[PDB]
Every structure is written in structure tokens, then in C-alpha cells.
Design a protein around this nucleic acid. Structure first.
Ligand SMILES: [Ca+2]
Ligand SMILES: [Ca+2]
Lengths: 228, 230
DNA sequence: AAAGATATCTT
DNA sequence: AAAGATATCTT
């Protein structure tokens, strides 16, 4: 299938190269990598989609989820969203998007209405942590600022957690497990419906959550009480 | 340092473009449409120059560790106490920049800054201004499609191009003047001094409400000051 | 944790 | 505007 091939396809940057052949090495910022990984998945996401007859689309306008929207023109409401993410192993975790945007307002901050996607994949890259230029002839001497990239493709609701991944930028956090857990799909939600209900009703600050729920158990008890 | 720094950036930029990332196996990947990527790609490009010019003048240059301003710190070991902060920025085409938070180091000397705020005597913004616009190989490189066009660069003191409105809400950022690239190079800002910059941003409220009674702009700040900050 | 930094875009 | 999205990271 589209999913199996993609996973199959997905299984080392030297730096930015300028049109004059000079190569600037990467820096220590963890920022540079997340984007680097998108650039690396791009060709693959595309060759596989095409092979399967999907069209790929990236956001045109800013502040929009997801990195890649795959779909057939024939099946407009069976859209697939793919989001590239990465973090360094130091048990790993991810921020998985806002809980106050599109999941609460179907058309807020998403390239296509949320009800139009029937899958939300996360391709996660996991990795391990000279100020001069080089030429192609000396690629072998350029310092890599990370090693052991490992990746997995996995449905989002599956690895989603019950703790927010950020504060002022209200992000859903993922489970705080081992790479094998994301791959294997060991999560905490019974279903996607639960995943969504939990995050659609999550409050922003603890102060508002203490009177409602702050974890999956408390939420389930919250349902029992009558969502009151 | 300053004059040398810009001459270098001006010349190299008017003669060099980034085409994409390159792998350990020679495979070149074209850049993306992500605006946010460019702000870092220009940083990488700038590192060699900065290090080089700084080296001529006897400055040691340092980068931080996660969530710490600034991108580059320059100081002479014989004069550690006089640091130069350099923050790379970038944006597309009037232009506006977000110039960092107004609740970290400007209010608390050591919060989210590589060295105490009071150890720096200059904070320079090197701004990159551009216009928005397969797996390649070196011998193809010249014809790889870029996502920007007409990159310009200025080097200016931060307090100079700093504005009197927030550059962000939830993340409490200082916003620059919303002006043309020329006003940035010439320094046609709104603050009279650096202290008027510091004071204004240190007493600025996070919400319109709180400001409603205090001051929401440079004129109001100045009237506020006249009365004795009342 | 849980809140708020880092940084940039947007109505 | 001003406030709240896109992200990821650390206190
Ligand atoms: Ca930096
Ligand atoms: Ca910067």
C-alpha cells in the first residue's frame, strides 16, 4: 500500500552548498535539522505518492499544518496528512501540533479542512547529538553534527500523549517512551476518538485542568462523572 | 570590526546563492518553501565571514546552547567585559522583524542569554531581506531552483531599528519598525537612545488592557515620562 | 510538570 | 494592532 511502500522507502547531510561549490557546515542549533529532514523526505514522499497516484501539496500560506497533504482528486475526503518531526535521543518525546487550532475549528490553520483527512501520519526522525567552507573534493572532512538517524512512520493518535508538549504555544505532547514504542505503537488512547475528545477538551493551564482532568485516567473518570 | 563586517557581507551576498543541502554521498537536495528555514540558512552562510573578520580584529567568537540569545558573541579576551552580540535575522518583502523577547535578559540580566546582558556593549542585527519565489548533483548545481530572489543585507544596532509595538503576542517579542530596507540601513528608527529603548521595553505591558492605562506607543511613553511615569 | 523561553508569521 | 498560530526546547 501507500503506507507500506513509504515505510519501506524511508529504510547524512554535510551542509548547505552555494552555487560556487563552497560548502558551509551545519551548526549546533537543533532547529536546522527538523527542516533538513523535511528536505530529505520530500523526494521519497513524492516518488511513492506518484507511484500510488496521489498528488502531494505543501502549505503555500504560513502557519499551516501539515507538511505534506497527499490525496487523489477522485477521493477528496480521503486526504492523508504527513508531518515531519525530529528530536534528539538523550526515551524520546515530540510536540505534535496545537490542540486549540484545527481539531477545535475544522478550518483553522490547516491547508484543507480537518474533516477531509482520514489519516494523520507522523514521520519521526530520531538522531544522536568547522566554521569554514569546504569544496566537494573534501566532503569527507566536513563535521556532521549528529549521528544515528532512525525514523519511523506512525499514526498520530497512536503516539499521542496526555501531557501538553508546550505551554504558551499550546501543543499536544507525544508519549514519553522509547523509539520502539513509537514504532510498535504503544500508546495510551483506546482509539482516535478518545485521542481527539481528550485534546478537544483539554484546558490550557493546570489551574483550569485541576477542576477537570490532567491525565488520561482523570479524563476517563471525567467521562464517568458525566463530563461535568 | 563593524565597517569591515558589512563590506564582507555586502560583497559576498551580491555574488553568492545557496542552492540546497548536500549529503555525504554528493546528493544535493533543493531548499524548501519554509520561510523559517532561510533565517538559519543565512546564519550558516554568515558564520565563515563573521569568524574571519572577527579574527582579523582579535575577537574570539562564540555561539550559544539551546534557547539562548545571541547567535554570535564577540569579545577580546583582554577585554571580556566589552561584548558584541550579533543576531542574524531574515524576512521577506515594507519589512518587519521580531527582535527577541522583552521579558528575558532585558529584564533579567542572565535569563536566556549566553553572558550577562550587562557584559555586552553592542547588540547588532544582521538582517537578510529576500523576495519569495528532485535530488541534484554538483554538475547540475548551477541550475538548481532557489526559493528566494534578490537578497539584501544590512548590519544595524538593535535599539536603532527596534519599534514600539509587539512583534508577537504569546511569545512577547519586541517588533522592529515596519519600514523599507533603506530605513534599516540608514537607521531611521523611533528611539532617541539605547536607554530610551531599554526603559520603554522594560515597562511595556503584555496586554492592551494593562497598557491602556500605561502607554501603548512612543508618544504615550514620552508623555508618561513627563508626568513622572504616572 | 508546567510555564515560558528561543523565533517568525497573520489576520 | 494585538493575540494567537507554526515549532521545539528547558526550567
Ligand atoms: Ca544561531
Ligand atoms: Ca537569529
Amino acid at each position: 500500500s501507500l503506507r507500506s511502500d513509504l515505510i519501506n522507502a524511508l529504510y547524512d547531510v554535510c551542509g548547505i552548498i552555494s552555487a560556487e561549490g563552497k560548502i558551509y557546515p551545519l551548526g549546533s542549533d537543533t532547529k536546522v535539522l527538523s527542516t533538513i529532514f523535511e528536505l530529505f523526505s520530500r523526494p521519497i514522499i513524492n516518488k511513492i505518492a506518484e507511484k500510488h497516484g496521489y498528488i502531494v501539496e505543501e502549505p503555500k500560506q504560513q502557519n499551516h499544518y501539515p507538511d505534506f497533504t497527499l490525496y487523489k482528486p477522485s477521493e477528496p475526503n480521503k486526504k492523508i496528512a504527513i508531518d515531519i518531526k525530529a528530536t534528539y535521543t538523550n526515551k524520546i518525546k515530540f510536540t505534535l501540533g496545537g490542540y486549540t487550532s484545527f481539531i477545535r475549528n475544522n478550518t483553522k490553520n490547516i491547508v484543507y479542512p480537518f474533516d477531509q483527512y482520514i489519516a494523520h501520519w507522523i514521520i519521526g526522525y530520531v538522531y544522536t547529538r568547522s566554521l569554514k567552507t569546504y569544496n566537494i573534493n573534501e566532503l569527507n572532512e566536513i563535521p556532521k553534527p549528529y549521528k544515528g538517524v532512525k525514523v519511523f512512520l506512525q499514526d498520530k493518535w497512536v503516539i499521542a500523549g496526555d501531557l501538553a508538549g508546550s505551554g504558551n504555544t499550546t501543543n499536544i505532547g507525544s508519549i514519553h517512551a522509547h523509539y520502539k514504542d513509537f514504532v510498535e505503537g504503544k500508546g495510551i488512547f483506546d482509539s482516535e476518538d478518545e485521542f481527539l475528545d481528550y485534546w478537544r477538551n483539554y484546558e490550557r493551564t493546570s489551574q483550569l485542568r485541576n477542576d477537570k482532568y490532567n491525565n488520561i485516567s482523570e479524563y476517563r473518570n471525567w467521562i464517568y462523572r458525566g463530563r461535568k
